[PDB]
Amino acid sequence: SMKIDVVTIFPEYLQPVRQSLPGKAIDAGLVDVAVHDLRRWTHDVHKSVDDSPYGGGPGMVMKPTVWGDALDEICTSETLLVVPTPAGYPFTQETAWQWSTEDHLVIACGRYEGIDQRVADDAATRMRVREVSIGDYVLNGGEAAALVIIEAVLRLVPGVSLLEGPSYTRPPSWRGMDVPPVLLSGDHAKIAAWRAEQSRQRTIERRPDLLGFDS
Amino acid sequence: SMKIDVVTIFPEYLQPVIDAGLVDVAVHDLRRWTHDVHKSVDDSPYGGGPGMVMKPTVWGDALDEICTSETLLVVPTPAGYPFTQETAWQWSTEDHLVIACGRYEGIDQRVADDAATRMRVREVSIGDYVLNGGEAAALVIIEAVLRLVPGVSLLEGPSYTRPPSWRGMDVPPVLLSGDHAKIAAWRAEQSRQRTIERRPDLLG
Numbered sequence A: 001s002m003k004i005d006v007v008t009i010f011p012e013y014l015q016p017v018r019q020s021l022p023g024k025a026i027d028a029g030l031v032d033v034a035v036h037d038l039r040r041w042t043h044d045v046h047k048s049v050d051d052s053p054y055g056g057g058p059g060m061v062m063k064p065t066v067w068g069d070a071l072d073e074i075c076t077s078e079t080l081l082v083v084p085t086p087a088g089y090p091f092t093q094e095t096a097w098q099w100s101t102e103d104h105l106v107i108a109c110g111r112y113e114g115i116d117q118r119v120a121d122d123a124a125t126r127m128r129v130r131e132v133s134i135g136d137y138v139l140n141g142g143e144a145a146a147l148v149i150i151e152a153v154l155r156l157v158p159g160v161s162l163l164e165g166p167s168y169t170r171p172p173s174w175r176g177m178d179v180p181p182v183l184l185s186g187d188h189a190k191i192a193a194w195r196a197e198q199s200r201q202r203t204i205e206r207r208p209d210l211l212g213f214d215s
Numbered sequence B: 001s002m003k004i005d006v007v008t009i010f011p012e013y014l015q016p017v018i019d020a021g022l023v024d025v026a027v028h029d030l031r032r033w034t035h036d037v038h039k040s041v042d043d044s045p046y047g048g049g050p051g052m053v054m055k056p057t058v059w060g061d062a063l064d065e066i067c068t069s070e071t072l073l074v075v076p077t078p079a080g081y082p083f084t085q086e087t088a089w090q091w092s093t094e095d096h097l098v099i100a101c102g103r104y105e106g107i108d109q110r111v112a113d114d115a116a117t118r119m120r121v122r123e124v125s126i127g128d129y130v131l132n133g134g135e136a137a138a139l140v141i142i143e144a145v146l147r148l149v150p151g152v153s154l155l156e157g158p159s160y161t162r163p164p165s166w167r168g169m170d171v172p173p174v175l176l177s178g179d180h181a182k183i184a185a186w187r188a189e190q191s192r193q194r195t196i197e198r199r200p201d202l203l204g
Ligand SMILES: Nc1nc(Cl)c2nc[nH]c2n1
Pocket: A083, A084, A085, A086, A088, A110, A132, A133, A134, A135, A136, A137, A138, A139, A140, A141, A142, A143, A145
């Protein structure tokens, strides 16, 4: 069974991990997900986790000291440390398959302008570290990305290309819109071929990159 | 002022949303619009194959109640157009977003096609991986859009803060130099190197 530890300053926000696909995985005993408040490893009265960036710039950077202490306690040499960041390597379906075989994922959720780079650099001297992005958009922090990664990985664990075209179910006519007749015909070869043509049309239109075309 | 309605069979997933003003996020249990005592939301796919397809009659009723002509209907799906920061900026000025969360096998296509005859519909993916359902994607979309609502190229390089020395690693001395033109040039080179290494697709 897999162990996933999530470290965040917003532990309550990782509640969606519950009943859902990850929730079912947890209750089936296929994974254990534990969420940790980063502030647990602070020592000052104000529980500060961030400070202004060296060299200037807007916002705050998360302090290495607190993160270092947290990861010391939670990680081992076998840990795969996942660091969600807009500046990361792309997280893809291939990545999800790869991580689905891991014994222990630790996900370090950052906020503000991110985590002092020395945290990942230091961790990499003792364990495998993967800084990853889940897409080309900006988030306030890594927490929502952690949920996406957990969803993409867990649905692949034992025990749990091109675009899929349109799908239909009953009734065969609805608001004057009919299900494509071929889908009702029971002709496997014809259905297979129609579904391939639909997938091609959709992939060209929506994701031409998947077929090696521009945009 | 933006209103976001999310429709899902997992309302608790999305439930915990700041609470600062002109932004209302309401979550709706899709089972509210089911017709049968079993509260069925999906059915076997026409043409065969694995999985289930979400029912058009249920989704049709839900969207009829929740949507208006002004609504931007967002449908998270792995088969979508890509959701990008450009998309986020566009949607941030919308008065009403409705996010229809379904299982990845899909909502019967007639739902989106019907809706598109009376409102703007956007089927979108948030990346190149499959999720079992659109719920986590909706969280990402809501976050990416709302942080662009006032008061609601190249990769960035490494950042640093106190202490100047930690576990044998010093903050790059240039950042402490007070030469701010040089600091900008150093950061640009860091960005170049990181983009080449991690995201060469961004350079062409
Ligand atoms: N904070 C954060 N984390 C991850 Cl993985 C991201 N992927 C895209 N934007 C992102 N922002």
